[PDB]
């Protein structure tokens, strides 16, 4: 039943002999190619750009707090950008952070000499992070700190950026504290600011550009994440695949979800209008989000499938019409020597003849197929 | 400080192993991850999987031992893996170090034990 | 995860040259690179971590450089005892990138 078509006509009329005549006996079907989805542009892009090349950071006991949330956090521009040389990160990979979806993000950006930027780290012990910023054991964030001696540094020695450097205690994990105790020690008399064994627990550190690569400040930026305990708010961004025109493909135009072939419309549409439907209720044009033109749809090319034969007794050969399909995208039949093509569809295994006789295998359109020498 | 392991030897094909490694000298805390690699005899390294230190229970694996490999950490000295249906291309020396979370390399690396897959 | 591909397999230089090992990775690592060197008998000792920074006991001799996805090992000076094998790594140890090494290196004096 799926040697040849000869072989299709008699398992469908039930009969090893078969009459001369045409018999439709199976239904083509052109399968779609692919699946193309444009999805429209970005909807709310608050970037991490102004948070990254600001003006000037804050003071590292006192850093700069930013929250993210109902935006579309595009992590990509900072997957891109080879500056970054201390990308210590956890939690996520920089290549799937863009396809994971978080609830939340808090931005703590602040200015960190090389020395201690290895203390910007989970489970880390050091002066630094007790006493001005100190990262939580269970750190899903992700530590980003790039070089700016060229910009924070300059000549005499830098004295707005402050830090601490005196504490009884230690901070917990992300506290601030800019009341900034005075420190003290020993017996503690030192009611005022100096005093025995007392010093101002802030303090600042001169930054040069011919200083140290170690004491030169980097600006770092810490991205601490937070797990799905909630419908999330900030997400990463969605698929941009190409168009194919003239070929059977699957599309998704803003979740339209409709197959079929694609091709450029002369008919017209209003700026707010996004797709068109037919009488019948059933689509026929899509406007294309990501770039503002209309797309025809038609649906994918099917129709009967006749055997066209004489008398078995007379002869095996037979030829194949595909109705109401053009020949180009038939093969999507064994005999392509001859594939002619008429208004009832495409004739496959006969040739065209000039000459006109009576009608003896009607096929449509006032065509006729025959058995002839 | 320096890194021991117990429990290799030999182990008969197609059963279960487990392996220990302890420290001497410090704790696991959160700011160090304990990491497990193996070496072929006349191979390279290959790299098994991690856990964080502290009470931080995240646990990295990797692509090839993705459902043959248990790594936890049973105490703030001791920690464990396990390995299961054995083969002999399985046969290597595994070494057990350790991984500052600063993301520097591995320092202070294990003597290391040979296991054997072979009846 | 990242996998590492060191090449080449086998290198051969005379006492006093500099031999240079390529390691390059399928994904950017942002540096979190480290190299050892491991002798016949021994556990893998550290030698250049973050790709540029020499810790604490190593000879200025060895010397890490590169960015993105391409990173160099180069060693000046070579002597009798450096005879090994030198392995690169990527440091991601919660970061799902893995900690995969690549071809271990021969080096001939």
């Known amino acids: 039943c799926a040697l040849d078509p000869l072989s299709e006509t008699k398992c469908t009329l039930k009969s090893f002999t078969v009459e001369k005549g045409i018999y439709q006996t199976s239904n083509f079907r052109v399968q779609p190619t692919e699946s193309i989805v444009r999805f429209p542009n970005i909807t709310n892009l608050c970037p991490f750009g102004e948070v990254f090349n600001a003006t000037r950071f804050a003071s590292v006991y006192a850093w700069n707090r930013k929250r993210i949330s109902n935006c579309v956090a595009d992590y990509s521009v900072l997957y891109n950008s080879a500056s970054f040389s201390t990308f210590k990160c956890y939690g996520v990979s920089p290549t799937k952070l863009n396809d994971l979806c978080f609830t939340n993000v808090y931005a703590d950006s602040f200015v960190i000499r090389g020395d201690e930027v290895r203390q910007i780290a989970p489970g880390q012990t050091g002066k630094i992070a007790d006493y001005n910023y100190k990262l939580p054991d269970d750190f899903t964030g992700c530590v980003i700190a790039w070089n700016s001696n060229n910009l924070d540094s300059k000549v005499g020695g830098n004295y707005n950026y402050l830090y601490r450097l005196f504490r009884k205690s230690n901070l917990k994990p992300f506290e601030r504290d800019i009341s900034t105790e005075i420190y003290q020690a020993g017996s503690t008399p030192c009611n005022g600011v100096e005093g025995f064994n007392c010093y101002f627990p802030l303090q600042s550190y001169g930054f040069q550009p011919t200083n140290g690569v170690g004491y030169q400040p980097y600006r770092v930026v810490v991205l601490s994440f937070e797990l799905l305990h909630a419908p999330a708010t900030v997400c990463g961004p969605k698929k941009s695949t190409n168009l194919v025109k003239n070929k059977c493909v699957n599309f998704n135009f803003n979740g339209l979800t409709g197959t079929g072939v694609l091709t450029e419309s002369n008919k017209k549409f209003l700026p707010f209008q996004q797709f068109g439907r037919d009488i019948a209720d059933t689509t026929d044009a899509v406007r294309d989000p990501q770039t503002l033109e209309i797309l025809d749809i038609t649906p994918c090319s099917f129709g009967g499938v006749s055997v066209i034969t004489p008398g078995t007794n007379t002869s095996n050969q037979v030829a194949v019409l595909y109705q109401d399909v053009n020949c180009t995208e038939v093969p999507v039949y064994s005999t392509g020597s001859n594939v002619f093509q008429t208004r009832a569809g495409c004739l496959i295994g006969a040739e065209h003849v000039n000459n006109s006789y009576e009608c003896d295998i009607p096929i449509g359109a006032g065509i006729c197929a025959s058995y002839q020498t | 400080e320096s890194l021991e392991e117990s429990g290799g030897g030999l182990v008969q094909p197609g059963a279960s192993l487990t392996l220990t490694c302890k420290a001497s000298?410090?704790?696991?805390?959160?700011?160090?991850?304990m990491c497990w690699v193996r070496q072929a005899p006349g191979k390279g390294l290959e790299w098994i999987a991690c856990?964080?230190?502290?009470?931080?229970?995240?646990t990295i694996y990797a692509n090839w031992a993705k459902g043959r490999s248990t790594i936890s950490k049973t105490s703030s000295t001791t920690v464990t893996l396990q390995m299961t249906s054995l083969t002999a291309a399985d046969t290597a020396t595994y070494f057990c170090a350790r991984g500052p979370s600063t993301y520097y390399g591995m320092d202070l690396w294990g003597p290391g034990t040979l296991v054997t897959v072979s009846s | 995860d990242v996998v590492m591909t060191q090449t080449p397999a086998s290198v051969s230089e005379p006492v006093g040259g500099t031999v240079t090992t390529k390691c390059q990775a399928s994904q950017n690592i942002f540096n979190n690179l480290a190299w050892y060197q491991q002798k016949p008998g021994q556990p893998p000792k550290l030698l250049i971590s973050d790709a540029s920074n020499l810790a604490s006991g190593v000879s200025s001799r060895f010397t890490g450089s590169g960015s993105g996805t391409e990173y160099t090992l180069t060693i000046g000076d070579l002597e009798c005892a450096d005879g090994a094998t030198y392995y690169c790594?990527?440091?991601?140890?919660?970061?799902?990138?893995?900690?995969?090494f690549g071809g271990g290196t021969e080096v001939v004096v």
């Open positions: 856990t964080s230190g502290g009470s931080s229970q995240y």
């Open positions: 000298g410090f704790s696991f805390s959160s700011g160090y991850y």
């Open positions: 790594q990527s440091t991601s140890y919660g970061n799902d990138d893995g900690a995969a």
